[PDB]
């Protein structure tokens, strides 16, 4: 009748940290209880590889089955733009289904990163906003976090990337903190991970005065 296939990229953060293991994920849904084994062949720039890890079928709440195959991708392969192809074969499919995926293409560009303190006008509230402006980057894949005194700060939100007028992307990240903590002189830092920074990361600090 027709299983469907979906092919997912790795998490940007997994691709920008050499300590992590980025993965491509091939998901096949609407497999029937009757259908025989769902078979996976995987290719890297058109050359077959045999190190994919395919999971057992798992019955979903709707009584159909779902099958996932995961292929680890190497740091320099993903960032150099290699293409990953998942090929799904099964009796319920008249022809095998192929999906391809790779890093967004185009010349990388390095973001600049600027920390902006809260406005004087906001300093009447119980909490204040610390802002991190990340602009001029391409492609749009990126991760932003905040830390202070060696530990993640959790109360933040980051806009999506927005196309600027020169074809690059920008975003802003907002960390909300108690006013007291800002005035007492604590140092906060915005850490940005992006392909084109040296070693795919930078960190900028922000503190009173």
């Amino acid at each position: 009748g027709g299983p469907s296939v979906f092919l997912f990229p790795p998490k940007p953060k997994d691709t920008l940290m050499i300590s992590r293991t980025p993965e491509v994920t091939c998901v096949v849904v609407d497999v029937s209880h009757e259908d025989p084994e769902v078979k996976f062949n995987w290719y890297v720039d058109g050359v077959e590889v045999h190190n994919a890890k395919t999971k057992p079928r798992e019955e979903q709440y709707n009584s159909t089955y779902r099958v996932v195959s995961v292929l680890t991708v190497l740091h320099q392969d993903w960032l150099n733009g290699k293409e990953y192809k998942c090929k799904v074969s099964n009796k319920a499919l008249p022809a095998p289904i192929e999906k391809t995926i790779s890093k967004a293409k185009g010349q990388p560009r390095e973001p600049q990163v600027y920390t902006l303190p809260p406005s004087r006008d906001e300093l009447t509230k119980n909490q204040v906003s610390l802002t991190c402006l990340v602009k001029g980057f391409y492609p749009s894949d990126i991760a932003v976090e905040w830390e202070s005194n060696g530990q993640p700060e959790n109360n933040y939100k980051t806009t999506p990337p927005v196309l600027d007028s020169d074809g690059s992307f920008f975003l802003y990240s907002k960390l909300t903190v108690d006013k007291s903590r800002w005035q007492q002189g604590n140092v906060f830092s915005c850490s940005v991970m992006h392909e084109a920074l040296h070693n795919h990361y930078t960190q900028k600090s922000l503190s009173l005065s």
Partner: protein, 242 residues
């Protein structure tokens, strides 16, 4: 009354015919059709209602609908033991695939290609609200319909008339105990896997003088005459001492 297309639920503009086994009563009033067959050539919203024919027949409730998909059943009220035919019917007999049948909001069957579904011997677990869904150019979902499956008789319990550590030479009656809920039932008594007394309308069985070798595990089966509802009791442990 019987129906060509069996389905008591039909789309607007489709054909259905009622045969009577003459006068036709729709919603309690009389109509023209004298024929032993009633012809709805192109169903409309006024053809919905309670139909009866000529003593006189039980009602049949016919529903005319509009929608993308319509879950069709052959009737809405069943006794335990009866077959239930389901169909996920596409408007204008178009193609849907990857079809799902739902019972009480839980998908219970998936076909790659549209297909009807017949539950051959129903029972209380089949009681509930059914709908279907399917993929055409988009994923389309039918309204729910109520089906009713009524328990004919609960599963029997074997009851003994003297409690289990009992003495040689006693009378003990075994009773295969089940209440009908509106034909009569047929009963058979067993010891282990061995038959003590076969199919019979009597619900009791006597050991006139109990002996040591009557110690064992006793059970029973209650069956309708035609047997398409047949249910067994759990085993009761019975001991005779010297």
């Amino acid at each position: 009354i019987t129906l060509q297309p069996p389905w008591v639920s039909v789309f607007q503009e489709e054909t259905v015919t009622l045969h009577c086994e003459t006068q036709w009563f729709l919603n309690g009033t009389a109509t023209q059709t004298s024929t032993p067959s009633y012809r709805i050539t192109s169903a409309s919203v006024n053809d919905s209602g309670e139909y009866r024919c000529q003593g006189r027949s039980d009602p049949i409730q016919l529903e005319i609908h509009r929608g993308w998909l319509l879950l069709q059943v052959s009737s809405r009220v069943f006794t335990e033991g009866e077959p239930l035919a389901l169909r996920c019917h596409a408007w204008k007999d178009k193609l849907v695939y990857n079809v799902l049948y739902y019972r009480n909001g839980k998908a219970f069957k998936f076909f790659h290609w549209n297909s009807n579904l017949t539950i051959l011997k129903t029972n209380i677990s089949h009681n509930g609200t059914y709908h279907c869904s399917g993929m055409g150019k988009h994923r389309y979902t039918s309204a729910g319909i109520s089906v009713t499956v009524k328990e004919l008789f609960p599963a029997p319990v074997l009851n003994a008339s003297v409690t289990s550590p009992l003495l040689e030479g006693n009378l003990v009656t075994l009773s295969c105990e089940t209440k009908l809920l509106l034909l009569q039932l047929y009963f058979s008594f067993y010891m282990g896997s061995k038959t003590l007394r076969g199919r019979n309308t009597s619900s009791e069985y006597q050991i006139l003088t109990a002996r040591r070798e009557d110690s064992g595990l006793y059970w029973c089966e209650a069956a309708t005459e035609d047997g398409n509802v047949l249910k067994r009791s759990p085993e009761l442990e019975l001991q005779v001492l010297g």
